[PDB]
């Protein structure tokens, strides 16, 4: 017994509100389909060991996830079936095609790639080497 905050009278504990340090069941417990971060094993590393470095892409040092720098969200819903956001449906089933695309009716440009050469002026030049004719 080191110090206990005289836990509670039983007239205060009720049948709705109890939130622990959630350990979560293996895999299948959350709306997010993951286990949960293991976390730092000891706060002494957080408290007495801070490497001094202004990591080049974040406005302050207290905003380590400013432009989502480090958050791997896009990879994370590639491992669970249903996208948790209503924006991951946009471009999900494109690795499995429904129909191969045609490539006949297009807008191929011919007057700007066959009429113009790069640079030689070869009209006033003799043919030269390797000039087999039909």
């Amino acid at each position: 017994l080191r110090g206990k905050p005289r836990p509670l009278p039983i007239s205060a504990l009720s049948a709705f509100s109890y939130i622990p340090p959630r350990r979560q069941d293996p895999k299948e417990h959350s709306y997010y389909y993951r286990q949960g971060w293991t976390g730092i094993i000891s706060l002494y590393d957080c408290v007495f060991k801070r490497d001094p470095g202004y990591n080049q892409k974040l406005h302050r040092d207290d905003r380590e996830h400013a432009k989502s720098l480090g958050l791997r969200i896009n990879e994370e819903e590639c491992e669970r079936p249903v996208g948790v956001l209503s924006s991951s449906v946009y471009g999900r089933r494109i690795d499995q095609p429904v129909e191969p695309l045609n490539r006949d009716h297009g807008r191929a440009g011919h007057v700007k790639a066959d009429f113009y050469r790069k640079n030689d002026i070869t009209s006033i030049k003799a043919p030269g080497f390797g000039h087999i004719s039909p």
């Binding site: 080191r2 110090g3 905050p5 706060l43 002494y44 007495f48």
Partner: protein
């Protein structure tokens, strides 16, 4: 543990025994910090 004991103390101190308790927590912190620092200074430790 001893930091969690420290964070549970009173917000303001007026009484003598709270002062002595806070000082004792302080010196236990210093002993633990000194041991951790003397062990983390080098990679090879003689014993």
């Amino acid at each position: 543990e001893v930091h969690k004991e420290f964070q549970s103390l009173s917000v303001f101190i007026d009484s003598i025994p709270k002062k002595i308790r806070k000082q004792k927590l302080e010196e236990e912190m210093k002993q633990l910090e000194h041991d951790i620092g003397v062990l983390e200074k080098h990679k090879v430790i003689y014993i």
